[PDB]
Enzyme design. Structure first.
Site, PDB file in Angstrom:
ATOM      1  N   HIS B  41      -1.680   5.938 -15.967  1.00  0.00           N
ATOM      2  CA  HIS B  41      -2.884   4.348 -15.687  1.00  0.00           C
ATOM      3  C   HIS B  41      -3.437   4.738 -14.116  1.00  0.00           C
ATOM      4  CE1 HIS B  41       0.701   2.872 -12.963  1.00  0.00           C
ATOM      5  NE2 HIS B  41      -0.148   2.654 -12.348  1.00  0.00           N
ATOM      6  N   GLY B 143       0.282   1.432  -4.955  1.00  0.00           N
ATOM      7  CA  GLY B 143      -0.024   2.781  -4.495  1.00  0.00           C
ATOM      8  C   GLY B 143       1.579   3.690  -5.163  1.00  0.00           C
ATOM      9  N   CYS B 145       3.692   3.813  -7.631  1.00  0.00           N
ATOM     10  CA  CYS B 145       3.233   4.143  -9.074  1.00  0.00           C
ATOM     11  C   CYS B 145       2.853   5.733  -8.218  1.00  0.00           C
ATOM     12  CB  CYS B 145       2.132   4.146 -10.264  1.00  0.00           C
ATOM     13  SG  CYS B 145       2.086   2.305  -9.652  1.00  0.00           S
TER      14      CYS B 145
END
Ligand SMILES: O=C(Cc1cccc(Cl)c1)Nc1cncc2nc[nH]c12
Ligand SMILES: O=C(Cc1cccc(Cl)c1)Nc1cncc2nc[nH]c12
Lengths: 304, 304
Positions: B41, B143, B145
């Site tokens: 993503h 953030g 991720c």
């Protein structure tokens, strides 16, 4: 979201760990620049620990008696000195992995990360608080001595603790990096009183703010209190008296949540007087005091 | 003595963290050898996340659109591919700090350490369990991720988790390092059922053995139970049914303490039916399930 007992990343500290052996005793040392710091009881045998005369014991040791190994490589010891309860072993090579660092003496109620080590090798990392009675409730076994406590601010490691001893009660005692014990403790195998501990009130309030930020709000009530009223409750429940200095440090959390510090004190007062009634806050069934207001802001803001 | 929620030392993992930016999105990547792994993503904008067609979105991206920065140095991207929910960015330089590693898919109920990162920089480390429902109760902000979960066995890091998403309920979901989600989750901004979670019975029993080893013994009783009887109680209290495989894995702890697994089951049965009565076990007022039998032996034996 979510709130965990988070430790600092331990990499900068792992690079400083060495094994120190003297005679038959092996423990951990901290190698920063060309000095290796370790608990002075590395020079004792088990017979010495009942009442060691460290000055006399150290006189029988020479530089070559201190075996310092950084992983698989041997360090050459060119000097030794005792500073309070630590030994400083001067080595001929500066640690290439020395991070930016400071030695700090932390206050009771402050938190830090511990890198538990055995034989100079890191085993694990955990976060804990220096209790108001200057003990730490760590996880340490025989051989963990010399493991250090620290905080990190960007690229600077502030070392605040070196592990020395486990009291007969199972709690832990150690020194700052200048070898001064936190609390009344002495490095001898004798029963030693830790003295009355208290709950770190400002940390409990910070954790209640972390709970509100992360959605656990059931404990918020329609009440308020005063510092005087709250402190009568803190006295009954063995909590540290809250001061305006503590209220000021909670300012950022009070501003973020819109909950006045004395209103959060009233929630804490009600929880102390009534318990949790079988409920939880941030996965805990007790009031947690190992997060400072700074820790809460840091974790809730993602500081690296 | 003492028992803490201990994480593995994070140094080997810190050396692999990089920042990955694509368009306007920045998240963390894991650099091992000449490949950087990150959540797919990273290629989405906020408008894309409601229902992303990842294949189409990735077709509009070229190697030069993936900005990978290891600290302050830029990595040159020479290839890109999507594997399930992860992107693999081939870079022209092997990470000099690549530790010995494996990619493993952990089972629910197993534990691991998380190195929470933001902008490629480590912020903290904590230990957690993969819930029986394949979610993790972590501490992660926007953030985070690309932050990874891992275990260490001597010098080998087994990566088991990469963080992808926070469910609307505040719990966390992610993938193994081949990009396969743990659980039913999809990488889209839609409400998604996690499903019924249960308490990890074998881990609670392991932690009760850790409590006995560290001196907390008040919960030991004069009773015993059978697997069938205990499992009727586990059913009522939303605990995983205990199997002979779980009893076998508790063998070392049962041998160390001299307490038969079914006798410890009877203590657990009594605690489930009567609560703690205001008492604590290893500093907890609830039954802890985030320590496996292996974790207990490791912490109680000082494995490095
Ligand atoms: O307490 C000692 C040795 C010692 C005895 C007397 C005085 C001093 Cl300064 C040191 N070592 C230790 C530390 N932490 C945890 C442990 N579990 C077993 N032993 C442990
Ligand atoms: O959840 C997301 C972004 C996202 C949305 C929809 C699908 C996916 Cl795969 C990813 N980021 C995130 C992660 N963990 C914790 C957080 N707190 C705020 N945002 C967080």
């Amino acid at each position: 979201s979510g709130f965990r007992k988070m430790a600092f990343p331990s990499g900068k500290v792992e690079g400083c760990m060495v094994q120190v052996t003297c005679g038959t005793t092996t423990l951990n040392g901290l190698w920063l620049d060309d000095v290796v710091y370790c608990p002075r009881h590395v020079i004792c045998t088990s017979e010495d620990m009942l009442n060691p005369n460290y000055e006399d014991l150290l006189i029988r040791k020479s530089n070559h008696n201190f075996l310092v190994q950084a992983g698989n490589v041997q360090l050459r010891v060119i000097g030794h000195s005792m500073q309070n309860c630590v030994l400083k072993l001067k080595v001929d090579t500066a640690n290439p992995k020395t991070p930016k660092y400071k030695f700090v003496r932390i206050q009771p109620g402050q938190t830090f990360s511990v890198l538990a080590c055995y034989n100079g090798s890191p085993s694990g990392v955990y976060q804990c608080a220096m209790r108001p009675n200057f003990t730490i409730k760590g996880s340490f076994l025989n051989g963990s001595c010399g493991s250090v406590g620290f905080n990190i601010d960007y690229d600077c490691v502030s070392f605040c603790y070196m592990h020395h001893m486990e009291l007969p009660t199972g709690v832990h005692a150690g020194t700052d990096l200048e070898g001064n014990f936190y609390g009344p403790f002495v490095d001898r195998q004798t029963a030693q009183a830790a003295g009355t501990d208290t709950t770190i009130t400002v940390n409990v309030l910070a954790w209640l703010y972390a709970a509100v930020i992360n959605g656990d709000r059931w404990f918020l009530n329609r009440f308020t209190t005063t510092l005087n009223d709250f402190n009568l409750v803190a006295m009954k429940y063995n909590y540290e008296p809250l001061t305006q200095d503590h209220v000021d440090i909670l300012g950022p959390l009070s501003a973020q949540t819109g909950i006045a510090v004395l209103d959060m004190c009233a929630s804490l007062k009600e929880l102390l007087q009534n318990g949790m009634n079988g409920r939880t806050i941030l996965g805990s069934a007790l009031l947690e005091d190992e997060f400072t207001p700074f820790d809460v802001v840091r974790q809730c803001s993602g500081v690296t």
